[PDB]
Amino acid sequence: APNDQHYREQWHYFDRYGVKADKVWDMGFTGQNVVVAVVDTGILHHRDLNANVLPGYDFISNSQISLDGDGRDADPFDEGDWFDNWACGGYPDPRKERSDSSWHGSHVAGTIAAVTNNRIGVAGVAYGAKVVPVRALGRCGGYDSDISDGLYWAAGGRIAGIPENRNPAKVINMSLGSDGQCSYNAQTMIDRATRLGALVVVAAGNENQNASNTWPTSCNNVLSVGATTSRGIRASFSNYGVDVDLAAPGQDILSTVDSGTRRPVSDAYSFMAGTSMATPHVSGVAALVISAANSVNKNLTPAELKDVLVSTTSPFNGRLDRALGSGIVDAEAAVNSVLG
Ligand SMILES: [Ca+2]
Ligand SMILES: [Ca+2]
Ligand SMILES: [Ca+2]
């Protein structure tokens, strides 16, 4: 249905092992009046995002990470997390020497709610929804405490020195994480966000390791997402195991980025792979589900929304080599479930 130039390439919306977002748009549900926060590298000023981006906030405290000249500020612009000369560091490993800017937060944001039916570029899973960019990641990643403050604020939590969020999110997408157990502080903020009514949707990670060995997956009250391929099998790099709740397409995912290698230069589109790409598919479907639930006067708690998403998955291609939740997220079965 969408008129967008490169929609045809987004197999992950509509093909055999896609999320069946097409079958839900056919029902008139697009995630209208749903707000999804993206706790990530920030947002590009991209012709195929602008319309669907709401005021966010920049939680990065170290100015050597943010690359914008100060700590916390009201502008969640992705300056570009590029680096060279082993700035992150790991010298002398040549594979850690340098990286071009990822535009990670925008690729993720486009999956959720890229401007759709405007002819240019691509579509989003919940293109009737809106995105609040919570910038917590810059050069070399981010601090746990910036991430945790950011996710609490995303839900509507007040933080001293930060103007109240006018746009609290029902769904908080965290395409991020690292090695180690969930911290006391991060768990606490997740629990407070969940009590505010937000579903916290997180990436399993990309180290071909048991996702239980990582945060946010090892936290309570998150929905952890593994990555599958166009063939319906576990993508090679996807973390795995009992604490992965479900999976979504995380290989050859087309979305919105910039062509700049350092700072933004011009709007572009690219294929990426990672549980990071899978995660916003689930965040996008969560928003579709909520817009369907709204239409029948049905409120859903984060726990209930998570159960709908996990219980209505489509099957994998055979069994997998590792556990990856119940199936692949399925917007049609998820939405049909809440409409009776
Ligand atoms: Ca700043
Ligand atoms: Ca900023
Ligand atoms: Ca578009």
Residue numbers in the entry: 2 to 341
Sentences from the paper on this structure:
Dichelobacter nodosus is a Gram negative, anaerobic rod that is the principal causative agent of ovine footrot, a debilitating disease of the hoof of ruminants. In strains that cause virulent footrot these proteases are called acidic protease isoenzymes 2 and 5 from virulent strains (AprV2 and AprV5) and basic protease from virulent strains (BprV). All of these proteases are synthesised as inactive precursors with an N-terminal pre-pro-region, a serine protease domain and a C-terminal domain of unknown function. AprV2 adopts a subtilisin-like fold consisting of a curved six-stranded parallel beta sheet sandwiched between two and five alpha helices.
To investigate how the single amino acid difference (Y92R) between the active forms of AprV2 and AprB2 alters the substrate specificity of AprB2 we determined the crystal structures of AprV2 and AprB2 to 2.0 Å and 1.7 Å, respectively. The two structures were very similar (RMSD of 0.28 Å for 339 Cα) and therefore we will describe the structure with reference to AprV2. The proteases have two disulphide bonds, Cys89-Cys141 and Cys183-Cys220 and three calcium binding sites. This finding is consistent with previous studies, which have shown that AprV2 preferentially cleaves after phenylalanine or leucine residues. Comparison with other subtilisin-like proteases reveals several major insertions (termed I1-I4) in the loops that surround the active site cleft. Most notable is the large well ordered I2 loop (residues 82–102) that is tethered to the subtilisin-like fold by a disulphide bond between Cys141 and Cys89. The loop is well defined in the electron density, with low B-factors, suggesting that it has limited mobility in the crystal structure. However, the apparent stability of the I2 loop is likely to arise from crystal packing and it is uncertain if this conformation would be favoured in solution. We therefore propose that the I2 loop functions as an exosite, mediating the formation of a stable enzyme-substrate complex.
